[PDB]
């Protein structure tokens, strides 16, 4: 009845990398970047690095190496009481697999069709075009009048998407099959990349994880030799000090990050649940965060040597550019920009599998935290059958993605990608943190790692602990909680009910912490008081 | 105003070519399909082809694969096809029509008045 | 390469009864929601002016008479009550696949 223990300590390193590393990375941090300062974004980013997004990785990362129980029964160590956190994040884990799968379903096609002499997503001669459509690139001859469209777009929302036959989430009509088809592919390699548990998906991910890389090299020397990149680079880097006094800036930065490295989503804690107990979770931690915040930045760089380039093609500012903001800034503008590339057809295919295979390794990580908990919280029923209730799990995962692949499904996307993951996930890692630091002891905790790793964690851990940490998780949901979106995917005004909706999947996830307190605190006998203090200790059987 | 004007009648000699022209005037030819379709004398349309100037695509049906060839012109707005090996069958009316948009269906909105070879 | 093929290749419609011309392609004309299948029409010695688009939408500068339906792989031309100056020939075209293909053609008259 022993752990299957990683096996080598890079299967680990590179697990968690990949995890931490996915789709946000490419669109999200650029986008953000410019949007907030540029280089002056890079000042709040290590900020809220340094104070709010290493302290939770490694605090998270040593708790599941000492309990190694995964996320639900993991508080029975901790504080019995919030065991709800696991179930919470099982939801999450449910929304996430709706939409995020999806987004790589969508990849998948772009790659599948990005195997021709000529790509589709080049001129407006196809059957799905309207009469809105110009060539991106073409000469100033034919202007972009005010509501010009260019192939790329049209190739997106007409013939991928399919998003014209549907007219928002009233009519969320029809299921587009080859989308259908797409997603069944990537689940099948999602179980069979999960389902015998941690010795393959530790072996997968080496592949898995280290190709992204080697395509982002190549892009970003394509992107360099690109005429223009400088204009793209420039417009990058260029600080502007003016946009740090918001606290808008500081607010995106502190979410980006502790989204980026996505801690309190119950996988940090059954990645390290394997690793051996005395090994050293405080410099992978470290190194591992690290490479997720360079990769973002090279990621970003990526993006905008392309960026540049294709606003010096048209003589426009690269402002006038990137207006898209989520994955149409992959799927419309860099598809526009590999359709004229010199040797396109071959840059499109290993973007794509880029694309897929760092969002594969995502999905890998979140599903087998979810399989983790599940497992050590129910090893009477479960953990001898572990090939089995991996394909249950991935048959709910892909039936609740079915409603993400009708025609109007990108609205589904946009909607649990704000929504699902929001203000849940946030609150979720505010009361883990609580419970590891101020009900279950600090001097303690550090004890535990100082038995584990050799040493006590210094006074700024134990200080981004106790007190920084959790505030600052505190602001970014005091943030959320107060702006309701205006969600706007294609010309598409969200309506309120659908602002509603989004507010009942937040709270969906978060109505299970309340509700298992409330049947802990009716379970155990005694006055209050004495029924508080026997749930808030853990068991220790 | 869109409208298409193509040559005039030519003469049908066996063995011998012919050159049709359509200059297209009132729209971006750039981005619409120009097809041409043959009409014989007592007989219903029979399309023949496709081309797409700007990118210089070209459809053919399984009849006119080596038969016509189709040419396009951005300076003159024109767009040509080449008819060879002139038999007696192939003396009709030949239309240049214009092809609306993907999302209207491809519908051959405008047509020239048609050139007769005889 | 879409075979259509029009049932009713001679309508003897009197004045004041309406036409119905039958269309009948081999495989499905529709992708992405838009039935690839226009109908033409074609007086004596005149170039076809197109009638119907998408086989439901209205042409342009043509009467509300001439009305199109039907998706899939049946269509109709439903021509309101007929008159003397519409008896042409009506051809039904798809333009879904490599090589777009004429139907058979239908004259009308009286
Ligand atoms: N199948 C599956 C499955 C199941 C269970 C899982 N748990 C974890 C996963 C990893 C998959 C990606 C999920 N992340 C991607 C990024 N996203 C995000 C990034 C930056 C941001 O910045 C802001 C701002 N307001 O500035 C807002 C905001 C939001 C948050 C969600 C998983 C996959
Ligand atoms: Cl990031
Ligand atoms: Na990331
Ligand atoms: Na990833």
Same mark, same amino acid.
């Given at each position: 009845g022993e752990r299957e223990t990683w096996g080598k300590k890079v299967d680990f390193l590179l697990s968690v990398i990949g995890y931490a590393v996915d789709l946000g990375n490419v669109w999200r941090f650029p986008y953000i970047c410019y949007q907030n300062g540029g280089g002056a974004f890079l000042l709040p980013y290590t900020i809220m690095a340094i104070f709010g997004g290493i302290p939770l990785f490694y605090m998270e990362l040593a708790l599941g190496q000492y309990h190694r129980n995964g996320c639900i029964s993991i508080w029975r160590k901790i504080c019995p009481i919030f065991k709800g956190i696991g179930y919470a994040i099982c939801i999450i884990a449910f929304y996430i697999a709706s939409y995020y799968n999806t987004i790589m379903a969508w990849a998948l096609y772009y790659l599948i069709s990005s195997f021709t002499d000529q790509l589709p997503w080049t001129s407006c001669k196809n059957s799905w075009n309207t009469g809105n459509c110009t060539n991106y690139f073409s000469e100033?001859? *034919?202007? /972009?009048?005010?509501?010009?469209?260019?192939?790329?777009?049209?190739?997106?929302?007409?013939?991928?998407?399919? @998003?014209?036959?549907?007219?928002?989430?009233?009519?969320?009509? +029809? *299921?587009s099959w080859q989308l259908a088809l797409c997603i069944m592919l990537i689940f099948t390699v999602i179980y069979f990349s999960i389902w015998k548990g941690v010795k393959t998906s530790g072996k997968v991910v080496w592949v898995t994880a280290t190709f992204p890389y080697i395509i982002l090299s190549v892009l970003l020397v394509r992107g360099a030799t690109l005429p223009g990149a400088w204009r793209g680079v420039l417009f990058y880097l260029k600080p502007n /000090?003016?946009?740090?006094?918001?606290?808008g800036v500081w607010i995106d930065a502190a979410a980006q990050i502790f989204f980026s490295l996505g801690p309190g989503f119950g996988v940090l804690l059954a990645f390290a649940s394997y690793n051996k107990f005395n090994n050293n979770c405080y410099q992978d931690a470290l190194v591992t965060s690290v490479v997720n915040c360079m990769t973002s930045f090279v990621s970003g760089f990526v993006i905008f040597t392309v960026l540049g380039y294709m606003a010096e093609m048209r003589n426009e500012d690269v402002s006038e550019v990137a207006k898209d903001a989520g994955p149409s800034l992959l799927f419309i503008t860099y598809a526009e920009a590999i359709?004229?590339?010199?040797?396109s057809t071959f840059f499109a295919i290993i973007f794509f599998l880029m694309l897929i295979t760092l969002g594969l390794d995502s999905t890998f990580a979140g599903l087998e935290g979810v399989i983790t908990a599940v497992l050590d919280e129910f090893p009477h029923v479960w953990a001898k059958r572990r090939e089995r209730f991996v394909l249950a799990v991935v048959i709910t995962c892909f039936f609740g993605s079915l409603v993400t692949l009708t025609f109007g499904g990108a609205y589904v996307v946009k909607l649990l990608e704000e929504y699902a993951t929001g203000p849940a996930v946030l609150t979720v890692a505010l009361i883990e943190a609580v419970a590891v630091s101020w009900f279950y002891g600090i001097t303690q905790f550090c004890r535990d790692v100082k038995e584990?790793?050799?040493?006590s964690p210094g006074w700024?851990?134990? @200080?981004? /602990?106790?007190? *920084?940490?959790?505030?600052?998780?505190?602001?970014?949901?005091?943030?959320?909680?107060?702006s309701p979106p205006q969600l706007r995917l294609f010309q598409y005004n969200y309506p309120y009910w659908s602002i509603i909706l989004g507010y009942? *999947? +937040?709270?969906?996830?978060?109505?299970?912490?309340?509700?298992?307190?409330?049947?802990r605190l009716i379970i155990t006998p005694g006055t209050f008081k004495e029924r508080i203090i026997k749930s808030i200790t853990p068991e220790t059987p | 105003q869109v409208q298409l004007q193509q040559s005039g009648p030519e003469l049908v000699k066996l063995g011998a070519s012919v050159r049709i022209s359509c200059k297209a005037s009132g729209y971006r030819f750039s981005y619409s399909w120009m097809n041409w379709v043959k009409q014989r004398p007592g007989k219903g349309l029979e399309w023949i082809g496709r081309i797409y100037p700007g990118d210089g695509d070209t459809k053919y049906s399984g009849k006119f694969k080596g038969?016509? #060839?189709? #040419?396009?012109?951005?300076?003159?707005? #024109?767009?040509?096809?080449?008819?060879?090996?002139? #038999?007696?069958?192939?003396?009709?009316?030949?239309f240049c029509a214009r092809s609306a948009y993907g999302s209207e269906g491809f519908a051959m909105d405008y047509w020239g008045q048609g050139t007769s070879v005889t | 390469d879409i075979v259509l093929t029009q049932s009713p290749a001679s309508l003897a419609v009197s004045l004041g009864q309406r036409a119905t011309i039958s269309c009948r392609a081999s495989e499905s004309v529709d992708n992405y929601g838009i039935s690839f299948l226009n109908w033409f029409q074609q007086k004596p010695g005149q170039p076809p002016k197109l009638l119907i688009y998408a086989a439901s939408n209205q042409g342009s500068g043509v009467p509300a008479r001439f009305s199109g339906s039907g998706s899939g792989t049946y269509f109709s031309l439903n021509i309101h009550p007929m008159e003397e100056d519409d008896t042409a020939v009506y051809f039904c075209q798809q333009t879904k696949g490599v090589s777009w293909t004429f139907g058979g053609g239908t004259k009308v008259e009286i």
């Open positions: 100033d001859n *034919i202007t /972009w009048t005010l509501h010009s469209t260019s192939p790329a777009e049209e190739f997106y929302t007409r013939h991928v998407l399919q @998003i014209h036959r549907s007219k928002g989430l009233q009519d969320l009509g +029809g *299921i /000090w003016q946009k740090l006094l918001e606290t359709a004229n590339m010199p040797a584990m790793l050799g040493f700024f851990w134990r @200080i981004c /602990w106790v007190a *920084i940490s959790p505030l600052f998780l505190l602001f970014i949901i005091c943030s959320f909680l107060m009942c *999947i +937040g709270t969906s996830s978060f109505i299970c912490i309340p509700t298992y307190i409330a049947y | 038969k016509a #060839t189709l #040419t396009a012109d951005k300076s003159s707005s #024109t767009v040509y096809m080449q008819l060879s090996s002139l #038999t007696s069958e192939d003396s009709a009316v030949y | -």
